[PDB]
Amino acid sequence: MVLYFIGLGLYDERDITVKGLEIAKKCDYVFAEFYTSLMAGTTLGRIQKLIGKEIRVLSREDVELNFENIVLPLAKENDVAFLTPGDPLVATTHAELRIRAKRAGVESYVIHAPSIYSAVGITGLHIYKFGKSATVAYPEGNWFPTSYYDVIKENAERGLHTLLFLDIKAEKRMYMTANEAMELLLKVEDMKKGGVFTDDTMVVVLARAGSLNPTIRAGYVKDLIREDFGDPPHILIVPGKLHIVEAEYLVEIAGAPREILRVNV
Amino acid sequence: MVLYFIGLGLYDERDITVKGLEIAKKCDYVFAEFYTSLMAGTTLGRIQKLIGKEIRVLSREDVELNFENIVLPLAKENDVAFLTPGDPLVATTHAELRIRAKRAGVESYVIHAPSIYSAVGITGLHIYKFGKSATVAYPEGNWFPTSYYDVIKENAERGLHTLLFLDIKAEKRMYMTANEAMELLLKVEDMKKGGVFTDDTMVVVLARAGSLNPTIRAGYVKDLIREDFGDPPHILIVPGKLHIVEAEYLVEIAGAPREILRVNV
Ligand SMILES: Nc1ncnc2c1ncn2[C@@H]1O[C@H](CSCC[C@H](N)C(=O)O)[C@@H](O)[C@H]1O
Ligand code: NA
């Protein structure tokens, strides 16, 4: 008579925690969504096989409009699991689903999993130095999103790093690359000219975190905007003022230009 | 010839990922540290038993001063694992360890696990809204540090939430409670008097993140400062202005007072 929100992790079905696996294995019904993020190293079949259950994948509409109609009803007589990439409550609106669970008289539990939010640590940038986060959204029609631009400005002014979640259009199998994010930002810059994102802006790219050989690159936009970082998902980071050890890591590990060592502090 | 940085997760021995467990099991030597944080929901014996490997515990000094003499040499002819609570490389000085590894001609890989940074998503607060993070440290002798107070100030001023880690003495197994941190912040407020942290300030408390039964409480300081949040470790969060959705979650899930729906939104 309970509902479990269980994260699947960063890259493949093995990024699920042992706790999440044990529980997922003993659930009567298992649902899931693969629109909030992309797990580039696995397939539904592999996940199903690992857990030993058939998985009913739900779409955004099913979830946002009919969660209480498709999932909750079952969480009354059986134990139900709802799986998601990464951590279920990070950079999603899934937290509100717990309210629906409650209002429906259903107990819910959350099993965390490695998230891109903490995986930034592999970039060598101190995680406590990150400021407000943002999402680079694909423009659609005449509507051209720009708010993410100001987040960077506000953080950079405070010497804080900016984590940039990149857009997703799962139904169309479209995953924004760091390259596309950089192009969009240059356009916003050219429009606002606030000094925030230019060819000389040093950025960090993390691609396919959770895999054994993710792509970790750092450098100036002008040099990275056309570089091939491999398949999605990707995240773009605009570092603020760097500590010396951060610069050393970005250089020795992320192939950054030695001149960034000059923190110019 | 390989070094594995493997995350142990949040609370107990099942918080490690499936990938992390399998890789550890195939390693010839297994090290771990519990000075940055502790796995309050388990024990070394249970971790050793689950992994089925002998685990050598390293002190802060063993790591910071002698990592290249204790861990790296064994990684030249064997597969070695280095276990840390949470997600690897989150602790400020751990990234630099990969640099030490490279310098010694040792390949290193990162196996992620849940981190409090992402786990706090269970509080209902939107992750993108967190600003700079800080640690509340106890004063000592003539040293009265208060920077964490300024972090809260700068963040809140911009509508951002502040994640506050509470001081800990690993060796002594002595944690700072949420109640203690609040008293300290009130003392710092009485000194700086910046109208940042008062009896009227609204805060969130998270304890035992990772366990199936964590403690998530929200409310005003004057009602929570003497409340019992359970066994450590505790995490304190000073939210900035709330999105109505965030407040509804704190009210419905964290037992927050209806009052926040109008006062802090
Ligand atoms: N393994 C990975 N590597 C790089 N970026 C990733 C990633 N997983 C997620 N992201 C980034 O985050 C976006 C999804 S946002 C949802 C995040 C998820 N709940 C988590 O906890 O990680 C992607 O479009 C991408 O920009
Ligand atoms: Na953060």
Which residue stretches of B11-66 are H helix? 18-26, 44-51, 60-64
d(CA B38, CA B45): 14
Domain endpoint, select from B93, B114, B135: B114
What phi, psi does B24 have (nearest 5°)? -60, -50
Nearest to B19, CA basis, from A10, A232, A121, A250: A10
3-state SS track over chain A = CEEEEEECECCCHHHCEHHHHHHHHCCCEEEEECCCCCCCCCCHHHHHHHHCCCCEEECHHHHHHHHHHHCCCHHHCCCEEEEECECCCCCCCCHHHHHHHHHCCCEEEEECCCCHHHHHHHHCCCHHHECCCEEECCCECCECCCHHHHHHHHHHHCCCEEEEEECEEHHHCEECCHHHHHHHHHHHHHHHCCCCCCCCCEEEEEECCCCCCCEEEEEEHHHHCCCCCCCCCEEEEECCCCCHHHHHHHHHCCCCCHHHHCCCC
Domain endpoint, select from A77, A93, A114: A114
What share of residues in chain B are helix, strand, coil (percent, to 5)? 35, 25, 40
The answer for residues whose C-beta is within 8 angstroms of residue B52's C-beta and 6 or more apart is: B25
From atom 1 of ligand 1, which residue's Cα is the shortest distance away? A209
- Closest Cβ opposite residue B21 in set A18, A130, A160: A18
Distance A121 CA to ligand 2 centre (A): 11
Structure determined by: X-ray
Inter-chain residue contact A15 with B12, CB threshold 8 Å? no
- Angle between the A60-70 and A95-103 helix axes, to the nearest 10 degrees? 20
Report yes or no: B92 and B4 within 8 Å, Cβ to Cβ: no
Same domain, A107 and A90: yes
Inter-chain residue contact A245 with B209, CB threshold 8 Å? no
Beta strand A80-84 with A174-175 is: unpaired
Q: Give whole-number Cα distances, B14 to A9, A198, A212, B46, B258, in Å.
A: 15, 45, 22, 10, 36
Nearest-neighbour CA in chain B from A28: distance (Å): 18
Q: DSSP letter at B29?
A: E
Same domain, B141 and B99: no
Sign of CA dihedral A62, A68, A69, A73: positive
Distance B134 CA to ligand 2 centre (A): 10
Inter-chain residue contact B119 with A252, CB threshold 8 Å? no
3-state SS assignment for residue B217: strand
Query: Would you say A120 is a known binding-site residue?
Result: no
> Residue B14 corresponds to which amino acid?
R
CB proximity under 8 Å: B 153-182 to A: 154, 158, 160
Same domain, B139 and B152: yes
- Closest Cβ opposite residue B90 in set A16, A127, A248: A127
- Which residue, among A16, A18, A261, would best test binding to B if mutated, counting the most B CBs under 10 Å from its CB? A18
Domain assignment of residue B194, given as a range: 115-265
Same domain, B136 and B241: yes
Same domain, B194 and B243: yes
Q: Which tokens go with B147?
A: 């920077």
Q: Which tokens go with A47?
A: 């996940």
Size of the A and B interface in Cβ pairs below 8 Å? 183
From atom 12 of ligand 1, which residue's Cα is the shortest distance away? A165
Query: Would you say A236 is a known binding-site residue?
Result: no
Find chain B residues with C-beta within 8 A of A9's C-beta: 17, 112
Find chain A residues with C-beta within 8 A of B120's C-beta: none
3-state SS assignment for residue B191: helix
Domain endpoint, select from A114, A131, A157: A114
Scan for tokens 């790591």, then name that residue: B63
Same domain, A66 and A167: no
Query: Would you say B108 is a known binding-site residue?
Result: no
What phi, psi does B7 have (nearest 5°)? -80, 140
Same domain, A140 and A261: yes
Q: DSSP letter at B172?
A: T
Please tell me if residue B44 touches chain A, with a CB cutoff of 8 Å.
no
Report yes or no: B126 and B117 within 8 Å, Cβ to Cβ: no
Number of domains in chain A: 2
Q: Ligand 1: which of A6, A16, A35, A38 to mutate, most ligand atoms within 8 Å of CB?
A: A38
Domain CATH for A20: 3.40.1010.10
Burial of B124 (0-12, 13-18, 19+ CB in 10 A): buried
Same domain, B173 and B203: yes
Same domain, B101 and B135: no
Find chain B residues with C-beta within 8 A of A248's C-beta: 96, 99
Same domain, A176 and A208: yes
Residue ranges of E strands in chain B: 2-7, 29-33, 56-58, 79-84, 107-111, 134-136, 162-166, 168-169, 174-175, 202-207, 215-220, 234-238
Domain CATH for B120: 3.30.950.10
Task: Report cis status (omega within 30 of 0) of the bond before A233.
Answer: yes
Query: Would you say A209 is a known binding-site residue?
Result: yes
Q: Give residues (CB < 6 A) around ligand 1.
A: A 10-11, 36-37, 85-87, 90-92, 115-117, 165-166, 168, 206-210, 233-235; B 118
Same domain, B87 and B125: no
Same domain, A110 and A159: no
Q: Which tokens go with A70?
A: 């498709």
CA A218 to chain centre: 19
